Design a protein around this ligand. Structure first.
Ligand SMILES: O=c1ccn([C@@H]2O[C@H](COP(=O)(O)OP(=O)(O)OP(=O)(O)O)[C@@H](O)[C@H]2O)c(=O)[nH]1
Ligand SMILES: O=c1ccn([C@@H]2O[C@H](COP(=O)(O)OP(=O)(O)OP(=O)(O)O)[C@@H](O)[C@H]2O)c(=O)[nH]1
Ligand SMILES: O=c1ccn([C@@H]2O[C@H](COP(=O)(O)OP(=O)(O)OP(=O)(O)O)[C@@H](O)[C@H]2O)c(=O)[nH]1
Lengths: 131, 131, 134
């Protein structure tokens, strides 16, 4: 576990349908993630600079280029996926091999209803990636 | 206080529920404990060789037997307790009398919410036991 | 450097909070100071007669008056400070000019994490201060 990580600039891109993963699910998940990451010594220091819905793998590269071109110092994009989807491969293609943007994916079902264990799982993955 | 102690091989046995005491709580606690123990000259070196959840006093002896048989040179088992529980008495019976394995219990609340004072308390007890 | 020093009656006053300078920090620092001072022939002997936390410059004079009255033959008060603080000036006012008590200050960072070099720095300062004095 890495100490001294602070996440100051981050975004959320939700590829799950809004009707299944609503704004209140996203805001609850956001605040619960911020709380446990601060508890663990990896504080997420503010609200995401960007939190929007996207549909389809075709939206990945334009949205990520937009993020890179709009938010200086972006550290992480949290990507909500609706189950198994071709969106995953495209997010990793653009993030890992095109633009060099750290991404962390999370399943829609763990945003609709968080648990401490699944928030912990996400925190540890982020800590490894940014550490 | 005894100088010259080095804790190379150690384990965590968490008898508190994972939903209350998550993996990222355990890993963050571990790093804070490593830091203060190193500063005080009794370094708890490396990650634990073993870190697993269990439930119930009846799980103590099977788990501790596995630890003793599996990790030669094991020096300490850190045991996380869910409040007041028969787990404590069984940990002391199995550790001190049945198997001969040094153990140090810590309350779940002090893993969920670490403070320098409670980490210091833990180091001093570990120092007495291993010194 | 004076040979033949034996520091038998000494105290610790910690003006940094316990949250910063914990019990295990104090006890580790004490044992490591005891070991190096013995090896260098100026042994700081035994546990301190007094080891307590306090806060603020106003707490200095009551505590030092208590120390002077309670522990006859007190040779040294080791004073742990968080850094720059008005407590330092008060420690030296009360110790040097009011009560005539030897004090040696140490920064809390060097109690939180001792090193041989900073323990040596402290022993040399104590040796100058107490060597030859009565
Ligand atoms: O189609 C998919 C694929 C994956 N996922 C979910 O994405 C999450 C993994 O998302 P990650 O961001 O961790 O991908 P990664 O493993 O490639 O990152 P590295 O640490 O290896 O660099 C997992 O939770 C998985 O269930 C989906 O939800 N749908
Ligand atoms: O039922 C209990 C009993 C004890 N404990 C917790 O065990 C911890 C002590 O854990 P120890 O490992 O230090 O037990 P010990 O026998 O070696 O030390 P002493 O108690 O004799 O001083 C304490 O922090 C206590 O809160 C429980 O949580 N539940
Ligand atoms: O405000 C302060 C002042 C000093 N100190 C620390 O006190 C230590 C020295 O404390 P001393 O106890 O050795 O003072 P002194 O006899 O040398 O008196 P003068 O030199 O001022 O005449 C030094 O290590 C310094 O960092 C503080 O921590 N805070």
């Amino acid at each position: 576990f890495h100490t001294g990580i602070e996440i100051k600039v981050w975004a959320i891109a939700c590829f799950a349908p809004q009707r299944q993963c609503t704004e209140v699910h996203l805001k609850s998940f956001t605040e619960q993630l911020r709380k446990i990451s601060r508890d663990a010594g990896m504080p997420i220091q503010g609200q995401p600079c960007f939190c929007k819905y996207a549909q389809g793998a075709d939206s990945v590269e334009p949205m990520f280029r937009h993020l890179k071109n709009t938010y200086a110092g972006l550290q992480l994009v949290v990507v909500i996926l609706p189950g198994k989807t071709p969106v995953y491969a495209e997010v990793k293609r653009v993030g890992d091999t095109v633009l060099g943007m750290a991404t962390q994916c999370v399943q829609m079902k763990n945003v609709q209803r968080t648990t401490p264990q699944t928030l912990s799982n996400l925190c540890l993955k982020i800590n490894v990636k940014l550490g």
